[PDB]
Design a protein around this ligand. Sequence first.
Ligand SMILES: [K+]
Ligand SMILES: [K+]
Ligand SMILES: [K+]
Ligand SMILES: [K+]
Ligand SMILES: [K+]
Ligand SMILES: [Mg+2]
Ligand SMILES: [Mg+2]
Ligand SMILES: [Mg+2]
Ligand SMILES: [Mg+2]
Ligand SMILES: [Mg+2]
Ligand SMILES: [Mg+2]
Ligand SMILES: [Mg+2]
Ligand SMILES: [Mg+2]
Ligand SMILES: [Mg+2]
Ligand SMILES: [Mg+2]
Ligand SMILES: [Mg+2]
Ligand SMILES: [Mg+2]
Ligand SMILES: [Mg+2]
Ligand SMILES: [Mg+2]
Ligand SMILES: [Mg+2]
Ligand SMILES: [Mg+2]
Ligand SMILES: [Mg+2]
Ligand SMILES: [Mg+2]
Ligand SMILES: [Mg+2]
Ligand SMILES: [Mg+2]
Ligand SMILES: [Mg+2]
Ligand SMILES: [Mg+2]
Ligand SMILES: [Mg+2]
Ligand SMILES: [Mg+2]
Ligand SMILES: [Mg+2]
Ligand SMILES: [Mg+2]
Ligand SMILES: [Mg+2]
Ligand SMILES: [Mg+2]
Ligand SMILES: [Mg+2]
Ligand SMILES: [Mg+2]
Ligand SMILES: [Mg+2]
Ligand SMILES: [Mg+2]
Ligand SMILES: [Mg+2]
Ligand SMILES: [Mg+2]
Ligand SMILES: [Mg+2]
Ligand SMILES: [Mg+2]
Ligand SMILES: [Mg+2]
Ligand SMILES: [Mg+2]
Ligand SMILES: [Mg+2]
Ligand SMILES: [Mg+2]
Ligand SMILES: [Mg+2]
Ligand SMILES: [Mg+2]
Ligand SMILES: [Mg+2]
Ligand SMILES: [Mg+2]
Ligand SMILES: [Mg+2]
Ligand SMILES: [Mg+2]
Ligand SMILES: [Mg+2]
Ligand SMILES: [Mg+2]
Ligand SMILES: [Mg+2]
Ligand SMILES: [Mg+2]
Ligand SMILES: [Mg+2]
Ligand SMILES: [Mg+2]
Ligand SMILES: [Mg+2]
Ligand SMILES: [Mg+2]
Ligand SMILES: [Mg+2]
Length: 181
Amino acid sequence: SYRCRSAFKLLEVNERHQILRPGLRVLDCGAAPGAWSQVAVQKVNAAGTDPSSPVGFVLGVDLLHIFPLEGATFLCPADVTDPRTSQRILEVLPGRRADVILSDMAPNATGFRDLDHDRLISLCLTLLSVTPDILQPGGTFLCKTWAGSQSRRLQRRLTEEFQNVRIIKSSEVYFLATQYH
RNA sequence: GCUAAACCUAGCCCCAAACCCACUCCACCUUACUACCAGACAACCUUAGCCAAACCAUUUACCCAAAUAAAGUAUAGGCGAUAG
RNA sequence: CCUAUACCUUCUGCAUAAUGAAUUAACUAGAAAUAACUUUGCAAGGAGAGCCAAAGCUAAGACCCCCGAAACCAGACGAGCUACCUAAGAACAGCUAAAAGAGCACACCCGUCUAUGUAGCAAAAUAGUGGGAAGAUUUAUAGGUAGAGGCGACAAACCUACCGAGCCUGGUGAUAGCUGGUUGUCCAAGAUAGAAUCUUAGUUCAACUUUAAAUUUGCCCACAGAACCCUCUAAAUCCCCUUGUAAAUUUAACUGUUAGUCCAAAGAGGAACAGCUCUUUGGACACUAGGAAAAAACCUUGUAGAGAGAGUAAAAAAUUUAACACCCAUAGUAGGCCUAAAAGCAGCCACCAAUUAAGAAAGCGUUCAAGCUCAACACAAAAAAUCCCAAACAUAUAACUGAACUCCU
RNA sequence: AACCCAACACAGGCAUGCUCAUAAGGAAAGGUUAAAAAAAGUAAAAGGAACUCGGCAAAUCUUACCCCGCCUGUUUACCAAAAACAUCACCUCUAGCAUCACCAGUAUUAGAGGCACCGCCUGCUGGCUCCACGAGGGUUCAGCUGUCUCUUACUUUUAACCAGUGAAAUUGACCUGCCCGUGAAGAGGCGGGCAUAACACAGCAAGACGAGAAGACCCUAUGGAGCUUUAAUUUAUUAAUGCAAACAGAAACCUGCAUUAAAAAUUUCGGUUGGGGCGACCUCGGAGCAGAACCCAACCUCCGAGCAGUACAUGCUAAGACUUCACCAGUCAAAGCGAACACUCAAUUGAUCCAAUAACUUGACCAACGGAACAAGUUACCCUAGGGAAGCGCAAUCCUAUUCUAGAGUCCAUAUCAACAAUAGGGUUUACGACCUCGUUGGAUCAGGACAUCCCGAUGGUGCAGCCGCUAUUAAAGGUUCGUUUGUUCAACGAUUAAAGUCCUACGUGAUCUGAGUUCAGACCGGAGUAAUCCAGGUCGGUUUCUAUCUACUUUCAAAUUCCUCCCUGUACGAAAGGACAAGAGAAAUAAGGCCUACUUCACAAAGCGCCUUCCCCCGUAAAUGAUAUCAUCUCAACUUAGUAUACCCACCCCACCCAAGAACAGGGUU
Ligand SMILES: [K+]
Ligand SMILES: [K+]
Ligand SMILES: [K+]
Ligand SMILES: [K+]
Ligand SMILES: [K+]
Ligand SMILES: [Mg+2]
Ligand SMILES: [Mg+2]
Ligand SMILES: [Mg+2]
Ligand SMILES: [Mg+2]
Ligand SMILES: [Mg+2]
Ligand SMILES: [Mg+2]
Ligand SMILES: [Mg+2]
Ligand SMILES: [Mg+2]
Ligand SMILES: [Mg+2]
Ligand SMILES: [Mg+2]
Ligand SMILES: [Mg+2]
Ligand SMILES: [Mg+2]
Ligand SMILES: [Mg+2]
Ligand SMILES: [Mg+2]
Ligand SMILES: [Mg+2]
Ligand SMILES: [Mg+2]
Ligand SMILES: [Mg+2]
Ligand SMILES: [Mg+2]
Ligand SMILES: [Mg+2]
Ligand SMILES: [Mg+2]
Ligand SMILES: [Mg+2]
Ligand SMILES: [Mg+2]
Ligand SMILES: [Mg+2]
Ligand SMILES: [Mg+2]
Ligand SMILES: [Mg+2]
Ligand SMILES: [Mg+2]
Ligand SMILES: [Mg+2]
Ligand SMILES: [Mg+2]
Ligand SMILES: [Mg+2]
Ligand SMILES: [Mg+2]
Ligand SMILES: [Mg+2]
Ligand SMILES: [Mg+2]
Ligand SMILES: [Mg+2]
Ligand SMILES: [Mg+2]
Ligand SMILES: [Mg+2]
Ligand SMILES: [Mg+2]
Ligand SMILES: [Mg+2]
Ligand SMILES: [Mg+2]
Ligand SMILES: [Mg+2]
Ligand SMILES: [Mg+2]
Ligand SMILES: [Mg+2]
Ligand SMILES: [Mg+2]
Ligand SMILES: [Mg+2]
Ligand SMILES: [Mg+2]
Ligand SMILES: [Mg+2]
Ligand SMILES: [Mg+2]
Ligand SMILES: [Mg+2]
Ligand SMILES: [Mg+2]
Ligand SMILES: [Mg+2]
Ligand SMILES: [Mg+2]
Ligand SMILES: [Mg+2]
Ligand SMILES: [Mg+2]
Ligand SMILES: [Mg+2]
Ligand SMILES: [Mg+2]
Ligand SMILES: [Mg+2]
C-alpha cells in the first residue's frame, strides 16, 4: 500500500491534527522513496480522485531519483538547500505558493547522533529560512527532527514565526507548526 | 576386631460364655477442675456422594431380629447395569 | 595372552546417553463358580427332606494380584496469620510553612532498583539506594463475619508458610482402558488373516496358539477344468488321481496374541524414476552359531551334553587414462546475379575448366581486396571442517584356513 | 531469669514510658599465610558514556520534553507497585418508609452501578485542552565518574595451611584414555589404530546428552475442576398471581394444586484432515485397485444411492447351498399344497427396548447410518494420570565446477562472459481441500578446524604500454577495525584499513555471563465472540539453582608479521597525463617473550599509559641436453638448473631462619 514505513507516521499525525484536506498544496521535502507523497495525494485529492472535492497539488523534492506517481510531481535530483530548486519549486506550484510544508529530510548518520542533531537542525533552519518564499501565510509546517538541545532554537524560531507549535514523538521528534504569520 | 549380630516373653487376635463400669475427703459448665446472690437459653425435621451402568441424566446390594428349603423363583428395571 | 557391548521394564528394535536401583537386613503382591476334566461311592436311580436325572447323581482335587491420582459428598474444627468491621486506647522529633489526603526530614510503616544470598541468618533475608511519614496514617488489646461460605479501594487478592475454592475425620481398600511392580527348580508346545466399537493406549468375536478326546483321511499333486470385454499382454493361483509321507477334521475346556520391523519382488497414493506413506508374495528377526570391520532384518547354519578328534558351509574388490603428418598450390577469371564494392570465402544460380596435377572453395582474415592452410600433383576431473588411518607385499607350482552343520567316542 | 513468636543460644518479628549518646549494654579477629577465582570497599595517568537492551552500577549532584494516569491513596504476603483499582466531580437505575442491617434515617435521603477532578466544544452524549503530581514508560542538555578504551594497586571477607567440631543433594557396578568408523541415528566400555609405572595437592568448566526442579511444546483419558451461556435436564427452593380450601360478611393468615420470573442445582464436551481459520467427511454401490479362484492398496482420486415403476398367489410350505473374512443381518432354491396356462432394478437401507393397535401391521437425515431416551463453549488460574518431542544414498528444484561451441565481446567460440542441456558435488522440497496461515537465536569470553583465499606470498593468461584491474594455478605460517540506528536486532549509514573472507564446530561455547524470541500469572489499544475468553498482533511489567565425583586440561619452555616515508626515481614505461618493480635505510603499529633507569598508578614493591628484544623455507612454474617419434620436444623417458636449524635445560647440609621462591609441598640463600 505504501513504499516506506514512514507513511504510517504521517497518517497518525494527520488523523489527530487534521493537517491535510482536499485543495491544499503540499511540499514534501525528502520525499524519497515516496511514502509521504502517496499519503499527501490521497488526502489533498491531488490526483482528482473525488470530483466533489477540490484538487490539490503535491510536490516532492529529494536528492535521489523518485519513481513517478499519479497525481504527484517530483523534482529529482535537487537540493532543498540549493536556491535553484526553490526557484524551480515556485514556478511549478499553482500561484507560486504552497499551503502545507512536509519535511522528512535526514542527513547520513555520521555515527555520532550528537553531531547529527545540529546537522539536522541546520537543515531545518535552512528550510525555515526559505520557508517564507514557499509557504503562504496561515500555512502548516511539519519537519522531521532528531531530539536534542538545538531543537529549542528551532522551536524558538518557529514559535516567533508561527502562532502555534506542537511537539510530536523510533526516537524521532516532529515539530508541527500552523497558522504561519 | 570394632560397629554389630542373635534370644522369649510382654501382650494381643478370633470365638464361646455371660447382659457391663460409674460416692475416700476436697474441687469441677465462670477462663472446667474456681466455697458463698434475682435467672428464664433450651432437645426433635428424608442423608448425600464416591462408585456400577466402561459417559451420564431414571437407576446402582447395605443385618432389622429362624439356620435350611421354596429361590435367584414370582416380581422390579434408560425391562439394562442390576435389584428381589 | 586370547574371547566377551551391565540388569530390570517399556517399544518392531536398548551397550544404549529411555525408565528404576548407594548398599545391607526385615516386610511387601492371583482371593471365586456355572461348566468341563480327573479320581472314588452308588446306579435307572443319586443325595443325611428341598434338588437333578433319556447314565446319571453325590463328594473331593483343581482357575481369576499389589501400589499410585487430581476429584465428589456429609459432619466437625479454624479470622492469635491475613481481608474487612466493632468497642474503647496509643504514636507521629526537627525545619519550612500554612489552619494543606502540603514540602523537607528522624522514629515508624512500606519494599523501587542493584548487589549479596539460593539446604542462606531467613520455607522471602542482608546491605545500599528508595515511596510515605497530621493522615484514605501507623499500631497494641478484646469481639465479630466460615467454605454451597466469608471478605475484597477486582490482584480471580486473602481466609494459620503449595486457596479457580481452607483444613480435619468419615464414606474409602473412591475410581483410574494410565505408570510401575508382580518372589522355588526343570521340561515341553508356541508369532503378524480380519470385523465391530463415543473405537484405534481398550474390549468382544473370528483367526492363530494350548490341552484332552473321538474319528478318518490330510498335505504334496497327472491329465482334465475356471470370460467374455477396452485391442492385447506377466509371475502365478484355485481344483486335483498318483506318489512321497503322517497328518487332518470333529468334540470338550479355556487363556494369550493381534500398528510388527527390515530385506527381495509386483504394485497403490491428481499419469510423481528417488525418498515418504500404504497393500500383496516370500524370507529373516522378537530362537542358536559362523561369516560380511563394529552389525536384530544380508549370507551360511538350525533340536540343544562332554572331548586337548575329524570333514566342510558362507567367507579377502578391482582399476592408471591424450605425441604426430610429410610435402606442395602458377593458371581460362574479381564464373555471373544482386550489392557502395562484397572477389572461392554478405547472400544466392551454376557447378564447368588450361597444365603432369589444384574445390567455380573445406575452414580461418579482410568494409571489400590482400593473405593464408587443406584437398591435388610429384614424394578420460576433483574438494570441508579434532588427526592420514591396520601393518605390508608385483615372481617357489591350489592347496590350506573356517561353525553349536556333519561324522567320530 | 540471660525470657516471647519464627523447627535452633536463628543477622527475622515484637506495644508503650524514659535515656537521644549514654551513668547502661557489648566484642567484628581460633592460629597462620598473602596464591587463583569470588564478595565488599578505597585510590588512579590521559580520555569522559567511546561500555551497554538501557547512563544498570558508581560518581557528581544534574536541564528540557513526549506517552499514560488527574493528584494523595490501593493491589498480585513469596518473580508484575503499573498505564491497573480506588478517587473528589459527573451520570444512570431503584425506593414514599420506622422498633436488631439500611436507621434510631425519610427524595438536598438511602441503595445498586458507570465513569474518573476541573475547563472547553458537542449530543440535548461524545471529542479535546490543562494546573500540579509519579520508585510509571521513552528521549535529552550539561556535569560527572574504572561503564568502557585497558586495566592496576591496596585493605577486609573468602581463600590455602595447622588445631577442634562436623552436613547435604548425589551414587547399577567400574580396574573410569585419545583419534577415526560404526551403532536406538551424539561412544571412557563395540571395531581398526595410537597412547599408557603408580599415587596425592591446588585450579579450570570441554564432556560424563552433568545434578535438583520447573516452565514450555503438541498428543492421549468416554480422568478432573473454575468460569460463562440462547448446552441438556429440572423448579425442589424463593417470589409474584390464579384456583381450591378456610373464615367472616369483608379481609387476612395457613395449606394444596397450577402457571410465571428470579436464582440455583446436576451433567457433558463423538471421531477423521501437523495445528488454527474456513470447509469437508462418517452408511451403502461402481471405477483407479492387486492383470488369471476368492480376499486384499488405508490415505488419496472421481461418479452415484437414502428411489421409482409394474404386480395383487409381491400366496402357503419345504430338501440342499451361498454368505462381504466373527456375530447380527443378507441371498439362491428342487419338490409339495393352492392357483395360473421367488418382479424390473449395481446401491435404493436402521437392531433392541418402547409407543400405537381388537388384530394384522406401523413408528427414528437413530445420516456420528451396529444406533447412549434426553447435555454446548472456555481456561494464559488451571489440576491429575501418561506418552512423544538428532537423523531419512540415486525424482523435482537451486547453487557451484566442468562438458557441449549456440550466442555476446568492432573482427574473433574459448581476454572475459554465456543460453538450451548433460555430467560430478552440495542444499532443499515432496501423495494431495489444485483453501488460508502458523510451527530458536544475537552478544561477552576463549577459540579449534576446513580452503571453495578477503589481505600478505609465488606463478600463467589478458582486448597486460606503465601504475592499477580482470582471470586462473599454487599457498591456511600470520592477519581480518571502531562507531550510530533515520533505510533498526547484523540490514543500511559514518570514518578507516594491506583486508574488514565464505563456512563448520549441539546459537561452537549459558554447572563461565547476558539480551531477545518461542509465552505464559497483572494490564490496556485494535480485532473476534451473547459471554467466559481468544488472537503467530501492538505495548508495559515480570525468580531457575548447583559446595566439581570422573575424563580432559593447567608455561607446545624457544624461528614475526604488516604498513608508511625515503632511496632506486621522477627511473623503466608512455605522445603526454601519469607512473613501478627487485635491493637497502629509517620509522610506526600489532603480536609473542621480558623489564623498572626514568615517566605514570604508586613507593623496601606491584603495574602500564613506560621501556627493551624478536632469527627458516616453500613447489605454482620458468629453462638446457635429449630419445621413443635419428628434426623437434623442460623428461608420470634416462638427466641438468632456478628458491625445486640453532638456542634453552642440565650437579646432588638443611633442625631453624630469610627470600626477589611459594596456595600446601617444593626451591634459592644462611661465610
Ligand atoms: K475474633
Ligand atoms: K559499660
Ligand atoms: K508511579
Ligand atoms: K564442564
Ligand atoms: K459412533
Ligand atoms: Mg460410571
Ligand atoms: Mg468425562
Ligand atoms: Mg557411558
Ligand atoms: Mg538412580
Ligand atoms: Mg531383602
Ligand atoms: Mg457428581
Ligand atoms: Mg483479628
Ligand atoms: Mg471502634
Ligand atoms: Mg511533625
Ligand atoms: Mg503530607
Ligand atoms: Mg515526605
Ligand atoms: Mg484494602
Ligand atoms: Mg481484571
Ligand atoms: Mg485473570
Ligand atoms: Mg486402585
Ligand atoms: Mg522348545
Ligand atoms: Mg456409538
Ligand atoms: Mg488328493
Ligand atoms: Mg559336543
Ligand atoms: Mg597437400
Ligand atoms: Mg573345525
Ligand atoms: Mg545338530
Ligand atoms: Mg580464620
Ligand atoms: Mg581475585
Ligand atoms: Mg581516571
Ligand atoms: Mg553526557
Ligand atoms: Mg558497542
Ligand atoms: Mg554505544
Ligand atoms: Mg541510545
Ligand atoms: Mg542509578
Ligand atoms: Mg494515581
Ligand atoms: Mg490538583
Ligand atoms: Mg509480589
Ligand atoms: Mg502489601
Ligand atoms: Mg515488585
Ligand atoms: Mg481506573
Ligand atoms: Mg503514589
Ligand atoms: Mg545421605
Ligand atoms: Mg584411566
Ligand atoms: Mg564417535
Ligand atoms: Mg583434582
Ligand atoms: Mg477412547
Ligand atoms: Mg467444564
Ligand atoms: Mg461368513
Ligand atoms: Mg459406526
Ligand atoms: Mg458393516
Ligand atoms: Mg493475562
Ligand atoms: Mg604473508
Ligand atoms: Mg588451492
Ligand atoms: Mg555448556
Ligand atoms: Mg520496575
Ligand atoms: Mg567452580
Ligand atoms: Mg621499490
Ligand atoms: Mg635429437
Ligand atoms: Mg631443444
